[PDB]
Amino acid sequence: MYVRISGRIRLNAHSLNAQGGGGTNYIEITKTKVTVRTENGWTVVEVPAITGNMLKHWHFVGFVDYFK
RNA sequence: AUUGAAAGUUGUAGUAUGCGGUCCUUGCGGCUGAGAGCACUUCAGGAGUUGCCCGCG
């Protein structure tokens, strides 16, 4: 009933969660600022990240697909 | 069940099409491994020796 799952998954060669595309025929991906250790330094980096809402929508799609 | 609650930044799209690393080109011509050269010089198969011994067509 009450289940919680957490882990690491490897994926590559994707354009998931495009950052609203772009006017000049250039479609980018949503970016995220991340703070991390750099041997006594709080450095910040730019990484791709899929939003929770997209996973929500896909879960709803899967649920309605199986409930048919 | 937190001013949170519902939520795809979504769907469709070939950097693609024709385009010779191409045509000519001797690793080519001349060139004595040749001339001189004793397997030569010395040399006994050699020295001894009863077909031996008996004999009535």
From TrEMBL:
Transmembrane region(s): none
Coiled-coil spans in chain: none
Superkingdom of source: Archaea
Role description: CRISPR (clustered regularly interspaced short palindromic repeat) is an adaptive immune system that provides protection against mobile genetic elements (viruses, transposable elements and conjugative plasmids). CRISPR clusters contain spacers, sequences complementary to antecedent mobile elements, and target invading nucleic acids. CRISPR clusters are transcribed and processed into CRISPR RNA (crRNA).
Name of the protein described by the UniProt record: Type I-A CRISPR-associated protein Cas7/Csa2
Species of origin: Pyrococcus furiosus (strain ATCC 43587 / DSM 3638 / JCM 8422 / Vc1)
Portion of the full-length sequence here: 1 to 68 of 340
